[PDB]
């Protein structure tokens, strides 16, 4: 379904195709924080 990115032809060859892990950690921590906040908010119902 398309997706990905149109990288220049130089780096498009034999690529690993993995996003940097450091930026993924921040998004994961944000999702964890949101889930924990929702789970704590559920305690009043």
């Amino acid at each position: 379904m398309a997706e990905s990115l149109r990288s220049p032809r130089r780096s498009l060859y034999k690529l690993v195709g993995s996003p940097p892990w450091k930026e993924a950690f921040r998004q994961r921590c944000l999702e964890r924080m949101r889930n924990s906040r929702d789970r704590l908010l559920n305690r009043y119902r």
Partner: protein, 876 residues
């Protein structure tokens, strides 16, 4: 340099003498720009000026008015402009014969004249350069030196200045340049120069292409320029057919078929590398454009409006001519190569990969027989071609059709991974990695999973070229096995795991491969550590003792780095040890989050000690503190209320982190730690919260932080209000006014990035208010009397949410947060909010549409809000 000096260069050229004479240049001549062009403008017109001296003059002239940074020489342009009472008008008399003189190269004099002319054109007070150049394109003598130097100067001018400037005489320049584009000139180099100049003039010629009268002749001339004997004008002509394609796709239907089709196919069929490479580039660009057009058409269909750019499907129209010649190109693999030069076969591979995505499922019939037949050829060239091509077509067609091929080709690939050649094994590893990464259902079958795992673990000890793929082949496979768990009834964890029996051996082999003496090749060590993190992340309920052993080993490795962290000799030491420490901290976090609650107690002390000792680092640097802050942000959550003992020593380092606004990366991590993560201390942070609130207010005052810090601060305010609950007095008046003032900020619709940024600010303030109200009310059934201090503010909150509801560029989440903020006001008071709401029914739109929202959070919050409201209005 000077007229006196340049004649000395003609007699005795040198290297040190020229540098010695150049010392006075920047002292006097650069400052004394007036009456300095005059001496340089009386030498290189003379045929007696030798090449070696004229080049040594042109180089220094070009250095004087060209630079890597434009503005520092735009100052020189301004200084030159004030002298135009003589400037450029005296050198008019010089350039007319400086061209095309002495040795048969432009001698960089044309590059100097390009400086003057690109300096003039921003002011456009002296257009007379245009006739000065175009006069000698149709001149009776037309000596090749003059014509070629003139067209080279025209190219320089077209490629140097901002494209918008040259539109004043575009039509004349276009009419002139095509005159030199004809083969009728006996000189070959003039054709080269004319073709080069046209390439750079395409930037601003838009007004000419947009009407057919000239464009038909232009396309005829350009296409006929491809049927030429010289290699340089062939490659340049094809290089001008490309980047014409990308710029003017819309008009191509009259030219592509009759003219471009045959020449581009013959180009791809060319034996010499250059022409085939240019043809590959052309047909890659056309399918890139068709992919973008398909994306736009899909967007238009989603919106329901007809597309504004109908596609012609050039790439999809012709496949039977493309695939066979493409595959045959892969057979011409260089036996020995550095794997860095852009060989034609690599371009063919990437072109076929793009073709797979653009053509989708129609590529399979044309490429399948080659893959099936040449896979077992005794010639290693054809085996490499068959394996390399098969891995390129994985994207595109749906997995349903591609499944049987993978199923019946898997046995071949495993035995293909061992081969006397090396490139065959490399491409087999690449193919199997992409197969397991893109088609999990094909690699999850147990018919060959055990041989596959055995071959992978045996190959993990091979060269880095294949090891770097075996890592990231283990990943996206462990995750698929975790997702495909045989039973996942409870949300906690899968009870069993397809890799369970081999899991401990996999972990041991990964640990052994991590510390290989060749881990830096192809970033093998980082890939291995990432694969290990993904392995630990998706661990089963079973195999926990393997995680325990991994914890012990990784803790041994974590403290081991602390010695070389000090024993630094070079910047590369810092680079490597920073990367190693970051990976170690990430793996320690990921492995701590998995172990049992009881097991973390015996390790928490050493973990915290090592973390605090590492936190000193370089006395402060964004590359180190972030990892420690994330690690603590995980330890405090996993450990729970026992963190009280460690807090006393840690809090001054947290007070260092909070004030690090010069590096926003540390700031957001520290704020997140201060938030719900440190909130686990419950009603014990009260002694510590005062300086925390002070520092947060200071971070709210200083307007130097990144734009994303503010929502986190508001969320921390809300979490603190929830945590403390009944002792926010003497603090609420300090933050309520700040958030009130902040919330009224506005930004227009010129960029949707600002739209969703404002949306985040809105929701962060909304949830801060929800947290404040919940904390003030408390968990008691009765309402605490201290909540009366927020009563006079409620109508502003309702007006704020109504102002949110006035705009319609919503997204998910804000509606749920609004429902949450409205669903507790009724519980707080229950007698007045029932008559503030009904005066402005706009929130009923949010409530009623929330019942049908596309996310669970919004649906649940809107249902709860509607039930809360309806059960209070009935009492009337």
């Amino acid at each position: 340099m000077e007229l006196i000096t340049i004649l000395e260069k003609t007699v005795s050229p040198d290297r040190l003498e020229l540098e010695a004479a150049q010392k006075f240049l920047e002292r006097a001549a650069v400052e004394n720009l007036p009456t300095f062009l005059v001496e340089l403008s009386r030498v290189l017109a003379n045929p007696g000026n030798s090449q070696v001296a004229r080049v040594a003059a042109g180089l220094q002239i070009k250095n004087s008015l060209t630079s890597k940074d434009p503005d520092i020489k735009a100052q020189y342009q301004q200084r030159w402009l004030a002298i135009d009472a003589n400037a450029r008008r005296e050198v008019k008399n010089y350039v007319l014969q400086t061209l095309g003189t002495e040795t048969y190269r432009p001698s960089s004099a044309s590059q100097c004249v390009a400086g003057i002319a690109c300096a003039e054109i921003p002011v456009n007070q002296w257009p007379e350069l245009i006739p000065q150049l175009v006069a000698n394109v149709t001149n009776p003598n037309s000596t090749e030196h003059m014509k070629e130097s003139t067209l080279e100067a025209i190219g320089y001018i077209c490629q140097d200045i901002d494209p918008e400037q040259l539109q004043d005489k575009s039509n004349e320049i276009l009419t002139a340049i095509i005159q030199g584009m004809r083969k009728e000139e006996p000189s070959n180099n003039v054709k080269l120069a004319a073709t080069n100049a046209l390439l750079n003039s395409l930037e601003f010629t838009k007004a000419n292409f947009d009407k057919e009268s000239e464009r038909h002749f232009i396309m005829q001339v350009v296409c006929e320029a491809t049927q030429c004997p010289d290699t340089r004008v062939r490659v340049a002509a094809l290089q001008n057919l490309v980047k014409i394609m990308s710029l003017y796709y819309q008009y191509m239907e009259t030219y592509m078929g009759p003219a471009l089709f045959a020449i581009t196919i013959e180009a791809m069929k060319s034996d010499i590398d250059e022409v085939a490479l240019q043809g590959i580039e052309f047909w890659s660009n056309v399918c890139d454009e068709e992919m973008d057009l398909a994306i736009e058409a899909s967007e238009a269909a989603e919106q329901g409006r007809p597309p504004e750019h109908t596609s012609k499907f050039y790439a999809k129209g012709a496949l039977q001519y493309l695939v066979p010649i493409l595959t045959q190109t892969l057979t011409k693999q260089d036996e020995n190569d550095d794997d860095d030069d852009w060989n034609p076969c690599k371009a063919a591979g990437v072109c076929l990969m793009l073709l797979a995505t653009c053509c989708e499922d129609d590529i399979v019939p044309h490429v399948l027989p080659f893959i099936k037949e040449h896979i077992k050829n005794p010639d290693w060239r054809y085996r490499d071609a068959a394996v390399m091509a098969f891995g390129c077509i994985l994207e595109g067609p749906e997995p349903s059709q591609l499944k049987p091929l993978v199923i019946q080709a898997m046995p071949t690939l495993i035995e293909l991974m061992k081969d006397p050649s090396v490139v065959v094994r490399d491409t087999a590893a690449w193919t199997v990695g992409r197969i397991c990464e893109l088609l999990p259902e094909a690699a999850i079958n147990d018919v060959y999973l055990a041989p596959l795992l055995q071959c992978l673990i045996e190959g993990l000890s091979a060269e880095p070229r294949v090891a770097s793929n075996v890592c990231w082949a283990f990943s996206s496979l462990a995750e698929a096995a975790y997702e495909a768990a045989d039973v996942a009834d409870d949300q906690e964890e899968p009870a069993t795991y397809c890799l369970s029996s081999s899991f401990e051996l996999i972990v041991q082999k990964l640990l052994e491969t991590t510390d290989r003496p060749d881990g830096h090749q192809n970033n093998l060590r980082s890939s291995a550590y990432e694969s290990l993190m993904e392995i630990v992340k998706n661990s089963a309920k079973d195999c926990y003792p393997a995680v325990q052993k991994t914890t012990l080993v990784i803790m041994e490795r974590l403290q081991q780095v602390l010695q070389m962290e000090s024993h630094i000799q070079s910047t590369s030491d810092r680079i490597q040890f920073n990367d190693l420490q970051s990976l170690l901290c990430a793996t320690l976090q990921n492995v701590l989050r998995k172990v049992q609650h009881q097991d973390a107690l015996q390790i928490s002390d050493v973990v915290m000690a090592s973390l605090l000792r590492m936190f000193q680092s370089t006395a402060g640097s964004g590359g180190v503190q972030e990892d420690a802050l994330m690690a603590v942000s995980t330890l405090v959550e996993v450990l729970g209320g026992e963190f009280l003992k460690y807090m006393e020593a840690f809090k001054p380092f947290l007070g260092i982190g909070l004030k690090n606004y010069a590096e926003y990366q540390v700031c957001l991590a520290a704020v997140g730690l201060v938030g719900d993560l440190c909130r686990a201390l419950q009603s014990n942070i009260i002694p510590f919260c005062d300086e925390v609130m002070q520092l947060l207010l200071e971070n709210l005052g200083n307007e130097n932080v990144h734009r994303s810090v503010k929502p986190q601060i508001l969320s921390v305010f809300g979490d603190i209000a929830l945590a403390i609950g009944g002792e926010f007095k003497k603090y609420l008046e300090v933050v309520l006014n700040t958030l009130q003032q902040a919330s009224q900020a506005q930004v227009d619709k010129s960029d949707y990035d600002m739209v969703d940024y404002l949306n985040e600010l809105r929701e962060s303030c909304l949830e801060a208010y929800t947290g404040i109200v919940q904390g003030l009310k408390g968990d008691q059934e009765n309402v605490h009397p201290d909540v009366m201090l927020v009563q006079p503010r409620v109508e502003f909150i309702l007006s704020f949410i109504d102002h949110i509801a006035g705009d319609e560029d919503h997204t998910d989440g804000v509606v749920a947060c609004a429902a949450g903020l409205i669903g507790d006001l009724c519980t707080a008071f229950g007698k007045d909010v029932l008559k503030l709401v009904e005066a402005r029914p706009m929130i009923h739109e949010l409530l009623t549409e929330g019942r049908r929202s596309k996310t669970n959070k919004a649906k649940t919050l809107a249902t709860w809000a509607t039930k809360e409201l309806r059960k209070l209005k009935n009492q009337a």
